Design a protein around this ligand. Structure first.
Ligand SMILES: NC1=N[C@@]2(c3cc(CNCC(F)(F)F)c(F)cc3F)CO[C@@H](CF)C[C@H]2CS1
Ligand SMILES: [Cl-]
Ligand SMILES: [Cl-]
Ligand code: NA
Ligand code: NA
Length: 371
């Protein structure tokens, strides 16, 4: 309930993700590693790429072990490749333990590292099922719990408007959230797969078949800025959002993310924008709960200017930073469930706050899953 030593261990820039400080090898080599619930591989830069501040020099590690295997990771918006191996890893501002973990030494990349970012590697916090090249490559967290007394749990508080947050490894810190934590079951253990059962725009339900909300999946991803929604769902949300906000007009290219909208410094009409609610499948048969986010979360700032941080997806719902910055997210891996509670650091106005309200009566929530 109290892990002071880990509170505020995350840093980052708006749109460049959240990172924690890790130490790899013997003697320890410090690196800033990106906290990603979207991927399952622990991969750090191993070659002098120009964007990189620092990098893994395997030549200097007494405890480096070569796995004599390569890994090739193409993905939608880029590509990464490297050499597999094992080394001692510890977290300066995390649990007081040292683990032998698999590390992919990144040796070629394209659109992977961000020019201007302050990280050199990625921490894949998801499950082996999606780890590359196969589930036989034990992810870091799996290595962590297997080799220590660290409970199979982690919680993130991502804070937004430079940024910060907390990664509590092996527990929950009560200071990071107000009110109650409501848990949704992890459908499958690959990505952190959850089920959205109902969508409301200022309480006005989107009235779509709930299978649409989760086509083809719904995941909780720290390694994604936007709240990404399935194409059909995105169209419905934008119609509704546009409707709710008609008091002011915006170009068509704004909802598409192609343009920005500016207001005189601190004269933003927050109050004109609706709140967005995602009802998630509850812990009990026929029971749900809802997570409510403000325009503060979806209108990502770039004379004040903002970007519409809601976008159309071809890979299903991605509950990215736009969602995670409003809540304290518990990854209760032991109980195959994900808890949500109001972030003590979420951004809000004197009239509305992000909310986690419950319980609700929702039928055929299993029917919202996609097969
Ligand atoms: N969850 C994700 N992780 C990945 C990733 C993340 C970030 C950073 N995330 C965006 C920021 F910066 F806005 F937060 C990055 F720069 C490069 C990346 F390769 C690593 O896993 C790939 C699958 F193997 C898919 C991509 C995209 S989505
Ligand atoms: Cl406690
Ligand atoms: Cl469908
Ligand atoms: Na509390
Ligand atoms: Na696309």
């Amino acid at each position: 309930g109290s892990f002071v030593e880990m509170v505020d261990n995350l840093r980052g820039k708006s749109g460049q993700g959240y990172y924690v400080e890790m130490t790899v090898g013997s003697p320890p080599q410090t690196l800033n590693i990106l906290v990603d619930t979207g991927s399952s591989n622990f991969a750090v830069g191993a070659a002098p790429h120009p964007f990189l501040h620092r990098y893994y020099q395997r030549q200097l590690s007494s405890t480096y072990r070569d796995l004599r295997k390569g890994v090739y990771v193409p993905y939608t918006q880029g590509k990464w490749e490297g050499e597999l191996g094992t080394d001692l890893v510890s977290i300066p501002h995390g649990p007081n333990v040292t683990v032998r973990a698999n590390i992919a030494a990144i040796t070629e990349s394209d659109k992977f590292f961000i020019n201007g970012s302050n990280w050199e590697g990625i921490l894949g916090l998801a499950y082996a099922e999606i780890a590359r090249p196969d589930d036989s490559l034990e992810p870091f967290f799996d290595s962590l719990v297997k080799q220590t007394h660290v409970p199979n749990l982690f919680s993130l508080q991502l804070c937004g408007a430079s940024v910060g947050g907390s990664m509590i490894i092996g527990g929950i810190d009560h200071s990071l959230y107000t009110g109650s934590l409501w848990y949704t079951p992890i459908r499958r253990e690959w990505y952190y797969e959850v089920i959205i059962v109902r969508v409301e725009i200022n309480g006005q339900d989107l009235k779509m078949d709930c299978k649409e909300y989760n086509y083809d999946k719904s995941i909780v991803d720290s390694g994604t800025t936007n709240l990404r929604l399935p194409k059909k769902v995105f169209e419905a949300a934008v119609k509704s959002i546009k409707a709710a906000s008609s008091t002011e007009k915006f170009p068509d290219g704004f909802w598409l993310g192609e343009q920005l909208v500016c207001w005189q410094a601190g004269t933003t009409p927050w109050n004109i924008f609706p709140v967005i609610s995602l009802y998630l499948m509850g812990e009990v048969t026929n029971q749900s709960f809802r997570i409510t986010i403000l325009p503060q979360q979806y209108l990502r700032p770039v004379d004040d200017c903002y970007k519409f941080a809601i976008s159309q997806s071809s890979t299903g719902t991605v509950m990215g930073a736009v969602i995670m910055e409003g809540f304290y997210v518990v990854f209760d891996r032991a109980r195959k469930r994900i808890g949500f509670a109001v972030s003590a650091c979420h951004v809000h106005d004197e009239f509305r706050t992000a909310a986690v309200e419950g319980p609700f009566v929702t039928l055929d929530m299993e029917d919202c899953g996609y097969n």
